[PDB]
Amino acid sequence: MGNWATHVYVPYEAKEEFLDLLDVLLPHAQTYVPRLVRMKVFHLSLSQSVVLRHHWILPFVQALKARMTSFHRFFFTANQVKIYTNQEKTRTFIGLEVTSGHAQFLDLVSEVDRVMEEFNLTTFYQDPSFQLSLAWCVGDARLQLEGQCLQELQAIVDGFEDAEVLLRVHTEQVRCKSGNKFFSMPLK
Ligand SMILES: [Cl-]
């Protein structure tokens, strides 16, 4: 059956305005670190990447559905640019950290963590932050991206006028990736 990489997140339903903004942010960042790559899809993590035995994928998804189904949609703000790495410092990310709405993400995490525990999986990061990743690169490029680049990225974001794109984002769904499979579920 195998063990399958499993991750729970909140998709971000990117539309043209956001993608066009990223068309400016990413080349800006690439003047500092050319090898940055745009994310293909956008989401905010609610869990670590864990592994689940194949037999438990559908039960895990159904456990999530049962919990997530009662959780209402909500609004968040993600307009604070951040540079971060993975734990091993072998990948660097540019993302947008959630400010308003963080508390609602924490409530989602509390439910996901319960499902994780129900299946013996690791619960969420001990220092929770939520962020919408925009781009990544191999290696540790924090020093190149933090400082002037970050400030300039933030100023691009701060100059962006349509509040619905980053300032008042209305969540819609939670999704669970397991291997190559993606299981969606609505928020109320
Ligand atoms: Cl590079």
Numbering used by the authors: 78 to 265
Paper passage:
Usb1 is a member of the 2H phosphodiesterase superfamily, a large enzyme family containing members with known 2′,3′-cyclic or 1″,2″-cyclic phosphodiesterase (CPDase) activity, or 3′-5′ or 2′-5′ phosphodiesterase activity, or 2′,5′-RNA ligase activity. The active sites of 2H phosphodiesterase enzymes are characterized by a symmetric shape with two HxT/S motifs centered in a catalytic cleft. We report three high-resolution co-crystal structures of Usb1 complexed with RNA, which show the structural basis for this catalytic preference and unambiguously identify His120 and His208 as catalytic base and acid, respectively.
The n–1 nucleotide binding pocket in both the H208Q-Usb1–UUUU and H208Q-Usb1–UUUA structures are nearly identical (r.m.s.d. = 0.3 Å). The n nucleotide binding pocket reveals the H208Q mutation that was used to generate the trapped Usb1–RNA complex forms hydrogen bonds with a non-bridging oxygen of the labile phosphodiester and the sidechain of Ser206 in both the UA and UU bound structures. In the H208Q structures, Ser210 is 3.7 Å away and cannot hydrogen bond to the phosphate group. Our observation that human Usb1 preferentially cleaves the dinucleotide UA is consistent with the hypothesis that the enzyme removes terminal adenosines from U6 snRNA in vivo, and provides a molecular explanation as to why U6 snRNAs from cells lacking Usb1 are adenylated.
